Each structure stands twice: as structure tokens, then as C-alpha cells.
Design an enzyme around this catalytic site. Structure first.
Site, PDB file in Angstrom:
ATOM      1  N   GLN A  27      10.298 -10.394  16.771  1.00 56.29           N
ATOM      2  CA  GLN A  27      11.528 -10.886  17.442  1.00 56.29           C
ATOM      3  C   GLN A  27      11.423 -10.499  18.909  1.00 56.29           C
ATOM      4  O   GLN A  27      11.023  -9.372  19.238  1.00 56.29           O
ATOM      5  CB  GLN A  27      12.786 -10.259  16.815  1.00 56.29           C
ATOM      6  CG  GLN A  27      13.232 -11.023  15.531  1.00 56.29           C
ATOM      7  CD  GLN A  27      14.215 -10.230  14.655  1.00 56.29           C
ATOM      8  OE1 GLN A  27      15.397 -10.004  14.942  1.00 56.29           O
ATOM      9  NE2 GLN A  27      13.783  -9.802  13.489  1.00 56.29           N
ATOM     10  N   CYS A  47      11.764  -0.010   7.166  1.00 60.72           N
ATOM     11  CA  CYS A  47      10.764  -1.071   7.123  1.00 60.72           C
ATOM     12  C   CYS A  47       9.680  -0.663   6.130  1.00 60.72           C
ATOM     13  O   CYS A  47       9.316   0.516   6.118  1.00 60.72           O
ATOM     14  CB  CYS A  47      10.073  -1.256   8.478  1.00 60.72           C
ATOM     15  SG  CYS A  47       8.740  -2.490   8.531  1.00 60.72           S
ATOM     16  N   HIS A  66      15.391  -0.082  16.258  1.00 60.05           N
ATOM     17  CA  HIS A  66      14.019   0.469  16.245  1.00 60.05           C
ATOM     18  C   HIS A  66      13.684   1.465  17.350  1.00 60.05           C
ATOM     19  O   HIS A  66      14.268   1.495  18.427  1.00 60.05           O
ATOM     20  CB  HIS A  66      12.916  -0.615  16.444  1.00 60.05           C
ATOM     21  CG  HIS A  66      13.145  -1.889  15.751  1.00 60.05           C
ATOM     22  ND1 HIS A  66      12.597  -2.188  14.557  1.00 60.05           N
ATOM     23  CD2 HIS A  66      13.899  -2.977  16.156  1.00 60.05           C
ATOM     24  CE1 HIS A  66      12.985  -3.427  14.215  1.00 60.05           C
ATOM     25  NE2 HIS A  66      13.772  -3.900  15.185  1.00 60.05           N
ATOM     26  N   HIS A 103       6.336   1.857  14.329  1.00 54.74           N
ATOM     27  CA  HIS A 103       7.794   1.951  14.552  1.00 54.74           C
ATOM     28  C   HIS A 103       8.564   2.603  13.418  1.00 54.74           C
ATOM     29  O   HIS A 103       8.121   2.719  12.279  1.00 54.74           O
ATOM     30  CB  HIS A 103       8.462   0.521  14.846  1.00 54.74           C
ATOM     31  CG  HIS A 103       8.702  -0.326  13.650  1.00 54.74           C
ATOM     32  ND1 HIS A 103       9.738  -1.187  13.533  1.00 54.74           N
ATOM     33  CD2 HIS A 103       7.981  -0.391  12.456  1.00 54.74           C
ATOM     34  CE1 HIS A 103       9.645  -1.747  12.278  1.00 54.74           C
ATOM     35  NE2 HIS A 103       8.561  -1.265  11.623  1.00 54.74           N
TER      36      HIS A 103
END
Length: 113
Positions: free
Chosen positions: A81, A63, A107, A9
């Protein structure tokens, strides 16, 4: 459904993110609107061929997975999540998601396994 899915991602955080700081920027100052504007810009250049998702991920993703070209490794349900988890398991291997929102930020996900 497989037991786990592996995914990569690209995360674009914003000032209202759960942790408004990243490896690449000490204090995230961008707004939620600017973060989604960048996410959509990335999706459109990845869909046209102008950019490579894993290259963009290593360059701009907030990230720490950016060092591993966006890779998060494998994960089962009950770990990430729920918005991220649902979008990821729904993707076909090799398929990329549109914008996905979580408390960490916005994302773009790529299922690899």
C-alpha cells in the site's frame, strides 16, 4: 533509488482494520488509539534497548510475517500500500520508521536491504 527494498515490520491491527483478525488473535478488539499507543511503546523500548524489534515482531505483530521475525522479503514500488511503500523506500538500510498507517493497521518498519 534501488529497484527493490527488503524490509521487516511489526503490524499492530485494530477493530477498524481491513481484516480485523490475525494468526495470534481470532478477533482483533483493540481500538485505533490503543494500537498506536502499543506501536509508540514498542518504538520507545526499541530506541532505548529494552527490546529487540525482530523479537517484538515475532511476539506481537498481527501480520503472518511474525513467524519470519517480521520479514516481508524484497519488494518493488507498485506492490505494497502506498503509505508503507513510500516510508520503506525513504528509509536507509538499518533505519527504522516511526508509526506508519495503512488500511491493514499501524506499522513500524525496519529496512534491511
Amino acid at each position: 533509488e534501488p529497484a527493490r527494498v527488503r524490509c521487516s515490520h511489526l503490524l499492530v491491527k485494530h477493530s477498524q482494520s481491513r481484516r480485523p483478525s490475525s494468526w495470534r488473535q481470532e478477533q482483533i478488539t483493540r481500538t485505533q488509539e490503543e494500537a498506536l499507543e502499543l506501536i509508540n511503546g514498542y518504538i520507545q523500548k526499541i530506541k532505548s534497548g529494552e527490546e529487540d524489534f525482530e523479537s517484538l515482531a515475532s511476539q506481537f505483530s498481527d501480520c503472518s510475517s511474525a513467524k519470519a521475525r517480521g520479514d516481508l522479503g524484497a519488494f518493488s514500488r507498485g506492490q505494497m500500500q502506498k503509505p508503507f511503500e513510500d516510508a520503506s523506500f525513504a528509509l536507509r538500510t538499518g533505519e527504522m520508521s516511526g508509526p506508519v498507517f495503512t488500511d491493514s493497521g499501524i506499522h513500524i518498519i525496519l529496512r534491511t536491504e
